[PDB]
Structure formats: structure tokens, C-alpha cells
Amino acid sequence: GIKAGDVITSLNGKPISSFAALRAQVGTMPVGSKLTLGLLRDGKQVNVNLELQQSFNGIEGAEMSNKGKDQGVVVNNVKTGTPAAQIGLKKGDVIIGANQQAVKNIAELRKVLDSKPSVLALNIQRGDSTIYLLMQ
């Protein structure tokens, strides 16, 4: 519930000296640090609690999850600005196998990355089409 135009005045009871202090202060707190803030919107004291945030199995700019009962790995969707979406991965695909090794779930996807292949050859399906896609 922090709105724009508000002014942070304190942090954990200690008043802030400047924004440059605050950016440096919490810039060191570990990810997930629950803190409290002193706000000032329209001349009224507003205290708000918070918790730092980051900056299924998604691997390298591509989100995945399980599909069915050993129906491979269904593709969820990809942000068009990820390095995985630049290789032609589209929402809805399903990977039945990769690198001539049958894939039931995601534990057999990351067991293929446990083997670390130089190039990754996937046997995904988009529509009734059986296609292949390559990596690296």
C-alpha cells in the first residue's frame, strides 16, 4: 500500500538521513528482510511493514511445470525478452523427449541438464505437429 507521492521519513524507528542513505542501507539487507517504514502522505503518519523481494521448474528465461501423469512437461509461457523465448519457444508446447532420451516429468529434464549436453535437442509438440528445437 505504498503509493506514489508519499515520503519515507524513518526506517525501523531510526529517521532516514537521505534517500542515498536509504538506498545504501537496505541495499545490504539480505533478500527477504522484513522491515518497517515511516511514511508521510498528506501530512499524516503512516507506518508500513515490508519484506524484500527478488530481482514447477523454470530454467533460464522459460517457465515449466508438470503435465498430467507422465505426459512429459507442458510449456506454460515465456516472456518475449528472455534468451529462451529468442529460440522459438511458445506457450502450450509439450516435451515428450529430449536428446533421444524419453522425458516423463521435470526430474528427467534436469537429469538431462545433470548430464550437461553442449546442445539441447528437444522433441516438443505444438499442435498436432511433432517438431524439434535446439539450444546453445
Binding site: 534517500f19 542515498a20 536509504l22 538506498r23 537496505v26 541495499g27
Partner: peptide, 5 residues
């Protein structure tokens, strides 16, 4: 400037 806390 435009810095993000």
C-alpha cells in the same frame, strides 16, 4: 537522478 531503493 532516478535511483531505486
Amino acid at each position: 537522478c532516478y535511483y531505486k531503493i
